[PDB]
Amino acid sequence: EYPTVDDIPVGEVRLYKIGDGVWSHIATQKLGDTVYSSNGLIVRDADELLLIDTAWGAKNTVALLAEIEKQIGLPVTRSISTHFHDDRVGGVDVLRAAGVATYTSPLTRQLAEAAGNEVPAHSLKALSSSGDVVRFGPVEVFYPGAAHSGDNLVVYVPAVRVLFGGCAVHEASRESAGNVADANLAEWPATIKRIQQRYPEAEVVIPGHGLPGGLELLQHTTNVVKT
Ligand SMILES: [Mg+2]
Ligand SMILES: [Zn+2]
Ligand SMILES: [Zn+2]
Structure with missing residues (x-):
């Protein structure tokens, strides 16, 4: 049932229900002659929604908004x-x-500016140091330290124990680290250990790319990373 590149054309977006008031969104994109899928999250708060991550580009993001409005x-x-x-x-x-x-x-915001990428309009205060956590509506936002990139965050939904690990967590089937051009391989294991210690009751872990799993994806990541 979880959507894959085999069932999503570039420009279309699927939603997938994860728990009470929580969905992932899945989109596709072509870089080389390589098609990839990518995951974000949607979380209900009263009569509005908090979005976690774009759908990888302007065209997919227009389609994401239309699919959220439909469903x-x-x-x-x-x-x-x-x-x-x-x-x-x-x-x-x-x-x-x-x-x-x-x-x-x-x-x-600083790294996205340096890369030429689009830049979110507002800063989250108090996230500058490894181990910093803020509340934001129905989620927690945690900065566990450098890993896939120096700035990677994870997002936890306490009411239903869902962790979105983003690209600092690899899916079960992936055995290589992927794009490491912005990675800190030396800190990556310590960063995974902070996530493990902070969220020991998580029921679902969603990676930035690929199939959701449970807490076992965190150690799996550490294993892929060392090699
Ligand atoms: Mg770019
Ligand atoms: Zn990335
Ligand atoms: Zn990614």
């Missing part, structure tokens, strides 16, 4: 981007045009 029918009023790459901030300008208040950490 859920509540407005997206705020978003958080979990690092500075195009699968997280690509389409922020679509979000802004639609009246969404877009956020991320100050470091993500």
Whole structure:
């Protein structure tokens, strides 16, 4: 049932229900002669939605908003981007045009500017140091330290124990680290250990790319990373 590249054309978006008031969104994108899929999250708060990450570019992000309106029918009023790459901030300008208040950490804003990428309009204070956690509506936003990138964040939904690990967590089937050009391989194991110690009751862990699993994806990541 979980959507894969085999069942999503570039430009279409699927939603997948994870728990009470929580969905993932799945989109596809072509870089080389390589098609990839990518995951974000949607979380209900009263009569509005918090979005976690864009759908990897402007075209997919317009389609994401249309699919949310078809299937859920509540407005997206705020978003958080979990690092500075195009699968997280690509389409922020679509979000802004639609009246969404877009956020991320100050470091993500700085790195996205340096990369030429779109930049969320607002900073999350108090996320500058490894181990820092803030509340944001129905979630917790945690900065566990450098890993896939220097600025990567994870997002936990306490009411239903769902952790979105983003691109700092690899899916079960992946055995290589992927794109490491912004990675800190030396800190990556310590970063995974902070996530494990902070969220020991998580029932679902969603990676930035691929199939959701449970807490076993965290040790799996450490294993892929060392090698
Ligand atoms: Mg770019
Ligand atoms: Zn990335
Ligand atoms: Zn990614």
